[PDB]
Design a protein around this ligand. Structure first.
Ligand SMILES: Nc1ncnc2c1ncn2[C@@H]1O[C@H](COP(=O)(O)OP(=O)(O)O)[C@@H](O)[C@H]1O
Ligand SMILES: [Mg+2]
Lengths: 1707, 248
C-alpha cells in the first residue's frame, strides 16, 4: 500500500514543533541545446500575434516545440511544468491551422472554411483565453468567442465565429447534438488544455469528446488536428496514445525546463483539534510570509473561501504590527506612501482599505470590479507585498509573485456535500503563479496541509501521481448519448466505440488496476468490453432510456433517453423523473422531484446550519412535506431561496445553494421536456414557469417590470402592492396615461417605452374538419412588441399548445421563434389533430390554444377554439371490392388492328373490371386507382371504342402539360392510322390557334385551363357543342387550388351543356383513389354501377412504405442525419442489386446531396459505378451542363426542370441500362414516369419566400412519387419517407385512407360568375344559384359544411350560405364595375371592365388591381410594375435565397423597382426576369424556368392593360402595345431592329452595321454573296432567320373618310381603313427566337390626337389576306382644326408598324 | 401559527383521489319536474381546485335540450371572485357573461359549492347566501351542494321555498350561535344526474384570480368584474397568495 514519493536530489526534511517542513530545491539549468526563438524569425504576419512580450522571443519550452507545432500538422501532446507558457504554444498551432486556407499570394483570408476549438477546464480561464486570443488575433480579423454558457438554439448562430473557447462540458453538449453534425465537419484544430483532467471525475467528458471525434466521424472522413496540453505526470505515454499522437509530436518537459525554476516546500501541520490546527497554519504562514519579505520578494496566499482572504490578511497585518509592521508598508516611506495612499483612498470601500494602507490586499470575486483591479495593479506595481486570494486568481488573472503559499488545501465540494482536499489541477494552477519569469531568478511554492496529505501533494508536484480513467463511473450516461446519436444499434458498435476511450488504452496497459478478468484470454479485451456494454445497457433498459434485446441484440433509442442525452441529465435522475412525474403531479411535488435528482444525492443537512435552515423552511412559500432531517428538504428550501434571492450567512451553505442554481436550470428543463412529451398540461405549464423562475431568479407572482434590467427599484414596488392586474397596465396606448397609473411623471414616459417592448401576441383560430376523426386548425398570429436588441436578444421563443377543455391534455404543441423581422406582421399556422373517439361522438364545446413566452413572465395568450355549429363528416363508406379475375386480353377487343396498339397482350387486374364498362358501353364511367395502375390504357380504350363507332370527336384533359406532351407523341404514332385520325396538342397560349386546332383535330389533348378558356363561348362555338367524348384524367386534382377549381368549372360546364342541348356526351373520369366516389361520380352523372373506385392498397405491384420522423426538422428541408439514412437506403438498394431513386425539393439539393453521396461512397467499400470509368467518358462528353458531369461520373444521376433533352436522355439511359445505381430527382420531375425498385423521399418540406416559411408536401405530391416503386416478379417495391415528427401522423394516415377531395371553387367564384354572366348563361340571380347546382362545390357543402365555414350547418343554413355567397360576390362585381343589374325579376348585364376579364382568362382581382394602378400618365416602367403585380403570378416560386440574387441582378438592369413597395414579393422576381428577358441576360437554370412560366401568363395581361387604357380613351395604351411586342420578341423598344431576328449575335449585328444594313427589310433585300458572309449560322438557324424574314410584315395603310367635308362636332363619324400586304400570308404563326409559346399575329388599328394625348377609337384585327378593310366609328371633337393620326400596330414584331397623319376641320 | 394553510395546501394535492368515490343524492324520478345534468369533467375539475376546509363556490349556467325541455344540461361553471370560510362563503354578484362567445341562450341555473358537513337539507349559511344571490333575481335557481371529505364527494341538489328566501332576506348576516328561525324544510330535493357523455367548461375572472382569501381587503362583493373562458386556478395557487412571496 505504501508508495513512497521519490524526491529530487538535494531534497531535505526539517522538523519544527508545529509542523514537519520538507524542501525541494529549484532544479539546475538543463543542457542548453536550443536558442530562444526571437519573434523576428517568424513570418511577417504572425509577428503581430506576438506584439510586446518582454522577451521578444519564445521561452525554452516554446522554442523546442515550435518546429512540430507550427511547421507540423501532426497531433501533439505537450507535458510541461507549471507556468510554462501555454497560450503562445496554443497560438502557434492556431496560426498553422489558419495557414491551410488563406492563399500565400492573395491578401484575402478565407473565414468560412475553418473552425478552431479550444477546450479549457473552467469558465474563469475560458474567458481569459478569449480576451487574450481576441487581442492577439485581432489583426488577422478573426472572431474569438466564449462558446455560449447557457442556451442551445442560439448555438447554431455562433458559427459567425472562427475560434470557439469552450469548457469540456459545453463542447460535449454541443457536439452531442444531432443537428450540430453539420458544423463539427469544419473543426480542424481541437486544443484540449489541462488534458490531465482525464484523471478527475470530470475527465470522462474529455474521453467522450475524443471517442466521438475519431469514431463517429464516419463518411465525412477528415479528423481535426489535436494538441493536448498537460502537466507532467505518469501515464502521459498512454494519454498520447489515447489522442493518437505519434512520436514526432509527443513532448515531456522536466522541471529543468520551467522558465523561472520552481522551489517547493511542504509544511505538514500535525495538530489534531480545530482551534490549534487553525492557529498552527496561521503561524506557519506568517513565518514563510516573513522570510519572503526579508528577501525583497512578493507573495500570494491562496485560501478556500472569500471571507478567509480578509481574515487571513488581517491576522497578518496585526501579527506584523505585534512585532514590527515596517517591513511591508512600503519599499520606502517617501517613495511609496503618497503614491499608495493616494491610490489606497480612491476606489477602496470596504475593510480592504485598512489592509491596503498596510500594503496587503485581498482578492476574490463578489468584490467590486474596480476594487479587485486595484489589488491586482498595486501588487503588480510593488506597492502591495501580499495578495490573499481565493482560487479564481489562479485561472483568471496573470498576476505572478515570487512566492505562492497555499494555506490549507481544505475545500468544500457541494457536489459531494462535504469537505475535501484540493484537486491536483487546482494546486498545479495555483503554483503556476509562483515565479515571475522575466524578473525573478527562481520561484517558490509552499503547500500547507495535514501531514496525511503531504505525500500526495508531493507526488502531484513531482511528476508521480498517475493519470487514470474514470470512464466507468459515467459509462452508462455516456453510452446512452451515442445510442441516442444513433451510432449504436448493436452492441458491437459499443465495444468499438470503447476502443477510442482512455479507459481502453489504459486497461490494455494495467489490466490489474482496472480489474480485467484475463487479458491473455480476452486479447484486446473484447469480452470485457462486451460485458461492460451489456451491464450498462441492461441498467439503461431497466430505466426506459433504451430498448434492448440481448438475444436479438438490438439497441434502440427511447424518447426519455433522448432527453437525458440532450439536456445532459444523469440516467438515475431520468428514472426518478419517470416514476414520479404524473398527470396529477403538483407544484409542491415538483420541488420534491427536483430535489430527488441524482445530481443532489450527497446534499446533507449538517448539524450547525440546521438552526438557520429551520428559519427558512417555515417561511417557505411552497409547502415542504419533507422533514428538516431529510436532505430533500434542504435542496427544496434552497431552490425556493434562490428564487427569492435570499441572503445567506454560512459559507458552507452558500456554496451549496450556488451548486443548485447551476443545475436547476437544465434539470427543470428535462422535467418540462418529459411532461410535454407525455401531454400533461398542468405540470408542463408549471414547469415552464419554474424554468423562467430559475433564469430570472424571481417568482411568477411578480410584475415583469422587475424583469427589465433597465427599470428603477422603487417604481415596481408601488405597482406590485397596488394589485392592479399586470396585463391592465399593458392595455394603455397613451404615454401620459401609463404615467398617471404609476403616479410619477418622468418614470411614466420611460415605463411607457418599456411597456411597448414587452412581448404580446394576437391569436385567431378556426377549425376545419377534414374527416370525422381529423380536424385541421388554422391559426393567424401577430406579434406585438417593438424589438430592442439588448432586451430581447436574437430571438424570443414561444410555446404553442392546443389543449383539451379541462386544460390537462396537450393535443398539439410547437415552438415559435419570433425575431425582429417577424414582429408586427401577421402569419399563419395550420396543423391537424386526430379527435379521440369520445370527442368524435360528442364534440366538446371548445379546445384551447395557448402561446407562452419561454422567456417573459406573464406573456401568455390563450383563446377558446369553439366547435359550436359543427358537423363532422360521416365516416368513409368502404371502397368497391374487386372480383378476382384477370381474364381480359387484347384479343377480347374486337378489332385485330387495335390489338397491335397496346403492345401488352394481357389486361391488368384492375384494367379488367373496367374493360367491360369502358369498351363495351357508351356509359360514362369513373375510375379511381392508385398511380401506376395503367389508367392511360383506360383512356385509350374509350378512344378505340369511340372510333369503332365512327363517332365525331374527343378531348383528353390533363393538368400536366408535361404528361400531355409525352402522351401526345405516344398516341400520335400508335393511333394516327386507326382510320386516318389526326391527333393534336393544344398549347394554351393562343386561344385563336387552339380554336383552329379543334376544327382540325379528331382528338385534342388539353389542360383544364386551356380548354375551359375555349369552352366558355360554346353558345357561339358549334365544334364544342358537337363534342362526343371527354376523358378527364387525374380528375382528383379538382381539389388542387385555383387550377383545380378551373378543372371543376370545366367538368361542370360540359354537364350543363349536355343537359341543355339534350346532347349525349360520354364522360370518362380517370383519377386516384378517392375516399368517397359517390358524390364525385354523381356530380359527373354516372350511374352507381359505373363508378369503379378502389382502395389504395389494391395497386397490383406490391409496395412497402417505411416512414421515418426526425426531430427539429420542420425548420429546414432535410438535415445531415436524414441524408445519412437516405444514403443507407441507397446503399441497401445497391447491395440487393435493386435500383433506387431519391426525391429532393430542389435542384440545389440534388447537387448538394450528390456531393455528399460522392464523399460518402468513397468512404465505404461500395463506391462502385458497377461499370468501368473509361467507358463512361464518351457519354459524359456531351457536357450540356457541366454541373451534371462530375456526379454522373461516380454512379449518380440528376434530374431537374430545364435539362437539355441530351442531359435528360443521357442520364435516363445510363440508369435504364444499370450503369449509374442511383438517381436524384426534383420534386418537379416526379411527373416523369421513371420506374424503379426502391424510392427514397428525402425530406418533405418546401420553402416559399412568399410566406417566408417551409411548407410540407401535399399527399398528391407524395402519391406521384410513391407510384414510381414497382416490383420484379413476386418482389415488392419499397418506399422510404423522411419527415418531421408532426407530419408523420398525417402522412401515414392518408397514404392508406384517401384525403377527402373537397372544392376550391369559393376561391375563384368572381371570375366564374362574371364569366357565365358575360356569355349570357346567367342573366338572373336565381340562375346563379341554379348554376351552382351543377358544381361539385354544391355537392360538397352539404356533406361537409363546417369545412367551408358554414356556421348554421343545416340545409336551411347552407342554402342561406350559398345565396349570401352569390350576393356577396355580385356586390363586389357591380362595385368594381364588372356588371350592372337592372329591371327587366331582374337582368344582369356585363360591363366592359368585366367582359374583358371574361374574354382573356385574367382574374377579377387582377383587373381590379390594374384599374387602380393604371393612369393616362403611366410610363412603360409603370406598366411593367403594374404587370408584375398580377395575381396570376402567385404560382411563381421564390426559392431560398432568391431575393439575394434578385438584388444583385437588380443592379445590372435598366429599371428600378418602385422603392415604396417590398423587396420580397413575387412582383419583384417577375419585374426583373422580364427585364433579364428584354436585355437577353444569361440566367441560372432556375430563373430560366421562372421566366418561362412568367411568360406563359403575360400576353393575356398585356392585352388587358391595352384594353383597359384604351377603354378609358387614354393614348398611353400604345406604350402598352410597345410592351406587347417587347414581350413576344425578347427585346427593348429602344434596341436595334435587327436584334429581334433570330440568332443575330453582336458580331452578326456588327457586320450588319459595316454594310449599313439597318432594318429587317434591308435583310430581305441582302444579296446572296453578302448573305453568305454575314449569316454565319447553322442550316437550322438560317431556317428560322428565313422563317422570320418571310413572315415579317410589310403592310401599306390607306383610308377614306366617309365625308371629310361635312364634319359636325358631336356626331358619330366613321372612317374606313384598308390594309394591303404584298402577298396573302402562309399563316400568322409568329416567329420568335425568344418567346417559348405559339402566337398569332394581331394588329391594333388606333385613331387619336397626339397633342391632346387622346385616343378616339380602336380595333383588334388579323391581316389574313392580301388586302382588307374595316370601319371605325368615333365622336367628332369640338369645332376647329385638329391634327389626327392613325396607327397600325402589330403585337408580335418591332419596327413593323405604320402610321398616317392628316388634319380635319370641324364646323 | 399563521401557516394553517400549509397543511391544507398539502392536503389539496390528493384531492383528486376523492373522485374515485362520487356519490349522488337520488329519490324517485319525477318527469313532472326538472332534472339537472352536471358534466362529470366539471365536477372533477371543480373539486381539484377546491380546498379541504374552506368553502368554494361557483355559478352554473346551462340550457334545455329539444328532446326534453325539462332536462337542463349544465354547460358552463362560472368561477367568480369570492371569499371563502369554513361553513360559509361570500360570493360576488351574478357575473355579466353576455358578451362572451357561445353564450347564446344560456340560463343561469344556480350555484354549486363545497362543504364539510354532510346534510340532507340546505343549511343556514347556504340559505342566507342562496337568498342573497338569487332572491330578487331568479327564484328557481338550484343549489348543488357537494359534501367533500376524505375519501369521497357527495352531491345533493336543492330548490329553495319562498319561506326559505324570505327567511334568508331577513338574515343579512349569520353568526355562529344565533340560529334563529331556521327550518330544514326550507329546501327540497332537486333531481341531479351526473353525466360523462357531455363535457362542460369554465369561465373565470379575467384577472384569473377567484380566491380573495389572502387579499380580503381588495375583495369587492358587488364588483363589476370581467370574465373569460379559461382553466381555473387552484385554491392555494401562487397567484392567490401574493403576500407569501413577500416574506421570501
Ligand atoms: N395490362 C398492362 N400490362 C403491362 N403494362 C401495362 C398494362 N397497362 C398499363 N401498363 C403500363 O404500366 C405503366 C402504368 O401506366 P400509367 O398510365 O402510368 O398508370 P396511371 O395512369 O395509373 O398512373 C405504364 O408503363 C403503362 O404503359
Ligand atoms: Mg395517369
Amino acid at each position: 500500500t505504501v508508495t513512497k514519493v521519490s524526491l529530487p536530489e538535494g531534497s531535505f526534511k526539517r522538523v519544527k514543533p508545529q509542523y514537519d517542513e520538507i524542501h525541494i530545491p529549484a532544479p539546475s539549468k538543463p543542457v542548453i541545446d536550443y536558442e530562444l526563438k526571437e519573434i523576428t524569425s517568424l513570418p511577417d504576419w504572425c509577428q503581430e500575434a506576438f506584439p510586446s512580450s518582454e522577451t521578444t522571443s519564445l521561452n525554452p519550452i516554446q522554442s523546442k516545440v515550435f518546429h512540430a507545432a507550427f511547421e507540423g500538422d501532426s497531433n501533439m501532446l505537450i507535458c510541461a511544468p507549471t507556468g510554462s507558457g501555454k497560450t503562445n504554444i496554443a497560438l502557434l498551432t492556431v496560426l498553422k491551422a489558419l495557414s491551410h486556407h488563406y492563399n500565400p499570394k492573395t491578401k484575402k483570408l478565407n473565414l468560412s472554411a475553418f473552425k478552431i476549438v479550444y477546450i479549457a477546464p473552467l469558465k474563469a480561464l475560458v474567458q481569459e483565453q478569449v480576451r487574450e486570443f481576441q487581442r492577439r488575433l485581432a489583426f488577422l480579423g478573426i472572431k474569438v468567442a466564449e462558446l455560449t454558457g447557457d442556451s442551445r438554439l442560439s448555438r447554431k448562430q455562433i458559427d459567425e465565429t472562427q475560434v470557439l473557447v469552450s469548457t469540456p462540458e459545453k463542447w460535449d453538449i454541443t457536439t452531442r447534438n444531432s443537428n450540430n453534425l453539420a458544423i463539427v465537419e469544419l473543426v480542424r484544430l481541437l486544443i484540449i488544455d489541462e488534458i490531465h483532467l482525464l484523471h478527475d471525475d470530470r475527465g470522462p467528458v474529455l474521453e467522450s469528446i475524443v471517442a466521438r471525434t475519431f469514431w463517429a466521424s464516419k463518411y465525412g472522413q477528415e479528423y481535426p488536428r489535436i494538441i493536448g496540453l498537460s502537466a507532467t505526470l505518469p501515464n502521459y505515454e498512454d494519454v498520447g496514445r489515447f489522442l493518437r499522437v505519434p512520436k514526432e509530436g509527443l513532448f515531456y518537459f522536466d522541471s529543468s525546463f520551467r522558465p523561472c525554476p520552481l522551489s517547493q516546500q511542504f509544511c505538514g501541520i500535525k495538530e489534531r483539534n480545530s482551534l490549534k490546527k487553525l492557529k498552527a497554519m496561521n503561524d506557519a504562514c506568517y513565518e514563510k510570509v516573513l522570510e519572503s519579505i526579508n528577501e525583497g520578494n512578493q507573495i500570494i496566499v491562496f485560501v478556500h473561501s472569500r471571507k478567509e482572504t480578509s481574515r487571513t490578511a488581517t491576522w497578518l497585518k496585526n501579527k506584523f504590527a505585534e512585532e514590527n509592521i515596517t517591513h511591508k508598508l512600503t519599499k520606502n516611506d517617501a517613495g511609496s506612501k503618497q503614491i499608495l495612499k493616494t491610490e489606497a483612498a480612491n476606489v477602496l470601500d470596504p475593510s480592504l482599505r485598512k489592509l491596503i494602507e498596510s500594503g496587503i490586499g485581498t482578492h476574490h470575486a463578489g468584490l467590486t470590479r474596480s476594487d479587485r483591479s486595484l489589488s491586482e495593479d498595486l501588487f503588480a506595481d510593488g506597492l502591495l507585498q501580499v495578495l490573499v486570494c481565493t482560487a479564481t486568481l489562479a485561472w483568471g488573472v496573470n498576476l505572478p509573485a515570487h512566492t505562492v503559499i497555499i494555506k490549507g488545501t481544505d475545500v468544500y465540494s457541494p457536489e459531494k456535500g462535504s469537505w475535501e482536499q484540493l484537486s491536483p489541477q487546482d494546486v498545479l494552477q495555483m503554483l503556476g503563479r509562483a515565479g515571475r519569469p522575466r524578473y525573478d531568478t527562481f520561484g517558490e511554492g509552499i503547500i500547507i496541509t495535514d501531514q496525511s496529505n503531504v505525500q500526495y501533494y508531493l507526488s502531484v508536484l513531482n511528476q508521480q501521481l498517475p493519470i487514470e480513467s474514470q470512464f466507468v463511473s459515467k459509462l452508462v450516461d455516456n453510452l446512452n448519448a451515442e445510442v441516442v446519436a444513433g451510432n449504436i444499434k448493436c452492441r458491437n458498435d459499443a465495444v468499438n466505440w470503447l476502443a477510442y476511450t482512455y479507459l481502453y488504452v489504459r486497461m490494455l496497459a494495467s489490466p490489474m488496476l482496472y480489474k480485467v478478468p484475463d487479458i491473455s484470454s480476452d486479447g484486446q479485451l473484447k469480452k470485457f468490453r462486451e460485458s461492460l456494454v451489456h451491464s450498462a445497457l441492461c441498467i439503461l433498459k431497466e430505466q426506459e432510456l433504451v430498448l434492448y434485446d440481448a438475444e436479438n441484440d438490438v439497441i434502440e433509442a427511447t424518447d426519455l433517453g433522448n432527453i437525458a442525452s440532450s439536456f445532459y441529465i444523469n440516467h438515475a435522475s431520468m428514472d426518478v423523473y419517470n416514476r414520479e412525474l404524473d398527470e396529477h403531479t403538483t407544484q409542491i411535488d415538483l420541488f420534491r422531484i427536483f430535489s430527488m435528482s441524482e445530481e443532489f444525492k450527497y446534499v446533507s443537512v449538517r448539524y450547525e446550519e440546521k438552526r438557520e435552515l429551520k428559519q427558512l423552511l417555515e417561511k417557505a412559500p411552497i409547502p415542504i412535506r419533507e422533514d428538516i432531517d431529510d436532505p430533500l428538504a434542504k435542496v427544496n428550501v434552497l431552490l425556493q431561496s434562490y428564487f427569492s434571492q435570499l441572503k445567506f450567512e454560512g459559507f458552507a451553505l452558500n456554496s451549496d445553494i450556488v451548486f443548485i442554481h447551476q443545475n436547476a436550470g437544465r434539470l427543470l428543463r428535462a422535467m418540462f421536456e418529459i411532461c410535454l412529451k407525455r401531454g400533461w398540461g398542468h405540470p408542463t405549464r408549471m414547469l415552464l414557469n419554474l424554468c423562467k423562475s430559475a433564469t430570472t431568479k424571481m417568482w411568477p407572482t411578480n410584475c415583469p417590470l422587475r424583469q427589465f434590467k433597465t427599470c428603477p427599484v422603487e417604481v415596481i414596488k408601488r405597482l406590485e402592492a397596488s394589485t392592479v392586474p399586470w396585463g391592465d397596465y399593458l392595455q394603455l396606448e397613451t404615454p401620459a396615461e401609463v404615467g398617471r397609473a404609476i403616479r410619477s411623471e418622468k418614470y411614466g414616459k420611460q415605463v411607457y417605452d418599456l411597456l411597448k417592448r414587452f412581448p404580446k401576441m394576437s391569436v385567431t383560430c378556426n377549425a376545419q374538419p377534414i374527416t370525422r376523426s381529423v380536424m385541421r386548425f388554422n391559426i393567424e398570429i401577430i406579434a406585438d412588441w417593438i424589438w430592442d436588441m439588448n432586451v430581447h436578444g436574437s430571438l424570443e421563443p414561444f410555446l404553442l399548445m392546443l389543449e383539451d377543455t379541462d386544460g390537462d391534455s396537450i393535443l398539439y404543441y410547437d415552438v415559435l421563434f419570433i425575431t425582429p423581422d417577424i414582429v408586427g406582421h401577421e402569419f399563419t399556422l395550420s396543423f391537424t389533430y386526430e379527435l379521440k373517439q369520445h370527442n368524435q361522438n360528442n364534440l366538446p364545446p371548445n379546445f384551447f390554444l395557448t402561446l407562452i413566452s419561454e422567456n417573459w413572465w406573464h406573456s401568455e395568450f390563450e383563446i377558446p377554439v369553439s366547435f359550436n355549429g359543427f358537423k363532422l363528416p360521416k365516416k368513409f363508406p368502404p371502397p368497391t371490392p374487386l372480383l378476382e379475375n384477370i381474364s381480359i386480353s387484347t384479343s377480347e377487343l374486337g378489332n385485330d388492328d387495335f390489338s397491335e396498339v397496346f403492345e401488352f397482350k394481357t389486361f391488368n387486374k384492375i384494367q379488367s373490371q373496367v374493360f367491360e364498362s369502358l369498351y363495351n358501353s357508351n356509359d360514362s364511367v369513373f375510375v379511381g386507382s392508385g398511380k401506376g395502375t395503367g389508367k392511360t390504357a383506360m383512356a385509350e380504350l374509350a378512344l378505340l371504342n369511340h372510333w369503332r363507332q365512327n363517332k365525331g370527336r374527343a378531348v383528353y384533359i390533363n393538368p400536366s402539360g408535361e404528361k400531355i406532351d409525352f402522351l401526345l407523341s405516344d398516341w400520335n404514332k400508335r393511333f394516327s392510322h386507326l382510320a386516318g385520325g389526326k391527333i393534336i396538342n393544344k398549347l394554351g397560349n393562343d386561344p385563336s390557334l387552339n380554336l383552329k386546332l379543334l376544327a382540325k383535330s379528331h382528338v385534342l389533348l388539353a389542360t383544364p385551363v386551356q380548354f375551359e378558356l375555349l369552352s366558355r363561348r360554346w353558345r357561339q362555338r358549334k365544334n364544342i357543342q358537337s363534342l362526343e367524348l371527354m376523358i378527364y384524367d387525374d380528375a382528383h386534382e379538382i381539389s388542387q387550388g385555383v387550377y383545380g377549381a378551373v378543372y371543376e368549372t370545366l367538368i361542370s360546364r360540359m354537364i350543363f351543356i349536355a343537359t341543355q342541348l339534350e346532347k349525349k356526351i360520354r364522360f370518362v373520369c380517370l383519377s386516384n383513389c378517392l375516399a368517397n366516389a359517390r358524390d364525385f361520380g354523381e356530380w359527373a352523372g354516372m350511374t352507381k354501377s359505373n363508378i369503379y373506385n378502389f382502395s389504395p392498397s389494391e395497386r397490383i405491384e406490391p409496395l412497402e412504405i417505411n416512414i421515418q420522423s426526425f426531430k427539429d426538422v420542420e425548420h429546414i428541408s432535410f438535415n445531415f442525419s436524414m441524408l445519412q439514412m437516405a444514403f443507407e437506403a441507397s446503399a441497401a438498394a445497391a447491395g440487393n442489386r435493386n435500383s433506387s431513386s431519391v426525391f429532393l425539393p430542389s435542384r440545389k439539393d440534388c447537387m448538394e446531396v450528390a456531393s455528399a453521396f460522392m464523399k460518402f461512397s468513397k468512404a465505404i467499400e461500395w463506391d462502385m459505378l458497377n461499370v468501368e470509368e473509361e467507358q463512361i467518358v464518351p457519354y459524359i462528353e456531351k457536357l450540356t451542363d457541366g454541373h451534371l458531369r462530375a456526379p454522373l461520373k461516380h454512379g449518380v444521376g440528376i434530374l431537374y426542370k430545364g435539362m437539355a433533352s441530351n442531359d435528360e436522355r443521357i442520364v435516363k439511359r445510363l440508369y435504364e441500362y444499370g450503369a449509374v445505381s442511383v438517381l436524384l430527382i426534383s420534386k418537379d420531375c416526379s411527373a416523369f414516369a421513371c420506374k424503379t425498385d426502391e424510392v427514397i423521399i428525402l425530406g418533405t418540406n418546401l420553402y416559399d419566400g412568399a410566406e417566408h416559411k417551409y411548407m410540407p408536401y401535399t399527399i398528391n405530391e407524395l402519391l406521384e412519387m410513391v407510384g414510381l416503386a414497382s416490383g420484379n416478379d413476386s418482389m415488392a417495391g419499397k418506399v422510404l419517407i423522411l419527415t418531421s415528427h408532426n407530419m408523420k401522423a398525417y402522412y401515414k394516415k392518408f397514404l392508406i385512407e384517401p384525403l377527402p377531395t373537397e372544392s376550391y371553387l369559393q376561391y375563384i367564384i368572381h371570375d366564374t360568375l362574371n364569366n357565365e354572366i358575360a356569355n349570357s348563361i346567367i342573366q338572373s340571380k336565381q340562375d346563379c344559384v341554379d348554376w351552382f347546382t351543377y358544381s361539385y362545390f354544391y355537392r360538397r357543402i352539404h356533406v361537409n359544411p363546417s369545412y367551408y365555414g358554414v356556421r348554421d350547418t343545416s340545409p336551411h343554413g347552407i342554402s342561406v350560405f350559398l345565396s349570401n355567397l352569390v350576393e356577396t360576390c355580385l356586390n363586389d362585381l357591380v362595385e368594381s364595375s364588372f356588371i350592372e343589374i337592372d329591371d327587366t325579376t331582374e337582368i344582369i348585364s356585363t360591363l366592359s371592365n368585366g367582359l374583358i376579364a371574361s374574354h382573356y382568362g385574367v382574374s377579377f382581382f387582377t383587373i381590379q388591381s390594374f384599374v387602380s394602378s393604371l393612369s393616362n400618365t403611366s410610363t412603360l416602367k409603370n406598366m411593367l410594375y403594374v404587370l408584375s403585380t398580377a395575381v396570376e403570378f402567385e404560382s411563381v416560386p421564390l426559392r431560398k435565397g432568391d431575393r439575394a440574387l434578385l438584388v444583385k441582378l437588380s443592379k445590372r438592369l435598366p429599371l428600378r423597382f418602385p422603392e415604396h413597395t417590398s423587396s420580397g414579393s413575387v412582383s419583384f422576381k417577375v419585374f426583373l426576369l422580364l427585364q433579364a428577358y428584354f436585355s437577353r441576360l444569361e440566367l441560372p437554370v432556375d430563373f430560366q424556368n421562372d421566366l418561362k412560366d412568367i411568360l406563359e401568363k403575360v400576353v393575356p395581361l398585356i392585352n388587358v392593360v391595352v384594353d383597359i387604357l384604351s377603354a378609358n380613351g387614354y393614348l398611353n395604351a400604345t406604350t402598352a402595345m410597345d410592351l406587347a411586342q417587347m414581350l413576344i420578341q425578347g427585346v427593348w423598344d429602344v434596341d436595334n431592329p435587327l436584334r429581334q431576328i433570330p440568332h443575330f449575335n453582336n458580331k452578326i449585328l456588327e457586320k450588319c452595321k459595316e454594310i449599313n444594313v439597318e432594318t429587317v427589310y434591308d435583310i430581305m433585300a441582302l444579296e446572296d454573296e453578302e448573305r453568305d458572309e454575314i449569316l454565319t449560322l447553322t442550316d437550322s438557324q438560317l431556317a428560322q432567320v428565313a422563317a422570320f424574314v418571310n413572315n415579317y410584315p410589310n403592310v401599306e395603310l390607306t383610308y377614306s373618310l366617309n365625308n371629310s367635308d361635312s364634319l359636325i362636332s358631336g356626331v358619330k363619324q366613321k372612317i374606313t381603313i384598308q390594309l394591303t400586304r404584298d402577298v396573302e400570308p402562309e399563316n400568322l404563326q409568329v416567329t420568335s427566337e425568344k418567346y417559348p409559346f405559339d402566337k398569332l399575329e394581331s394588329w391594333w388599328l388606333v385613331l387619336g390626337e397626339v397633342s391632346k394625348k387622346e385616343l378616339y377609337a380602336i380595333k383588334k384585327v388579323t391581316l389574313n389576306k392580301e388586302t382588307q378593310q374595316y370601319e371605325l366609328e368615333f365622336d367628332t371633337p369640338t369645332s376647329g382644326k385638329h391634327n389626327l393620326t392613325i396607327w397600325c400596330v402589330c403585337d408580335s414584331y418591332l419596327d413593323a408598324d405604320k402610321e398616317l397623319s392628316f388634319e380635319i376641320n370641324v364646323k | 401559527s399563521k401557516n394553517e394553510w400549509r397543511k391544507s395546501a398539502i392536503a389539496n394535492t390528493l384531492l383528486y383521489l376523492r373522485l374515485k368515490n362520487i356519490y349522488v343524492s337520488a329519490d324517485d324520478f319525477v318527469e313532472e319536474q326538472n332534472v339537472y345534468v352536471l358534466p362529470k369533467n366539471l365536477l372533477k375539475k371543480f373539486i381539484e381546485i377546491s380546498d379541504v376546509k374552506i368553502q368554494v363556490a361557483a355559478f352554473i349556467y346551462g340550457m334545455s335540450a329539444k328532446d326534453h325541455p325539462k332536462v337542463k344540461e349544465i354547460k358552463t361553471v362560472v368561477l367568480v371572485p369570492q371569499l371563502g370560510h369554513v361553513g360559509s362563503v361570500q360570493i360576488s354578484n351574478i357575473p355579466d357573461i353576455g358578451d362572451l362567445p357561445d353564450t347564446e341562450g344560456l340560463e343561469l341555473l344556480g350555484w354549486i359549492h363545497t362543504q364539510t358537513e354532510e346534510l340532507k337539507f340546505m343549511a343556514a349559511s347556504e340559505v342566507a347566501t342562496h337568498s342573497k344571490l338569487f332572491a330578487d333575481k331568479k327564484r328557481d335557481c338550484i343549489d348543488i351542494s357537494i359534501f367533500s371529505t376524505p375519501g369521497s364527494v357527495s352531491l345533493s341538489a336543492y330548490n329553495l321555498t319562498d319561506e326559505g328566501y324570505q327567511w334568508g332576506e331577513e338574515n343579512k348576516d349569520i353568526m355562529n350561535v344565533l340560529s334563529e328561525g331556521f327550518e330544514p324544510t326550507f329546501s327540497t330535493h332537486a333531481q341531479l344526474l351526473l353525466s360523462d357523455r357531455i363535457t362542460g367548461n369554465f369561465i373565470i375572472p379575467s384577472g384569473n384570480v377567484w380566491n380573495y382569501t389572502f387579499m380580503g381587503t381588495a375583495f369587492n362583493q358587488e364588483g363589476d368584474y370581467n370574465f373569460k373562458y379559461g382553466i381555473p386556478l387552484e385554491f392555494y395557487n401562487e397567484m392567490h397568495r401574493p403576500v407569501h412571496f413577500l416574506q421570501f
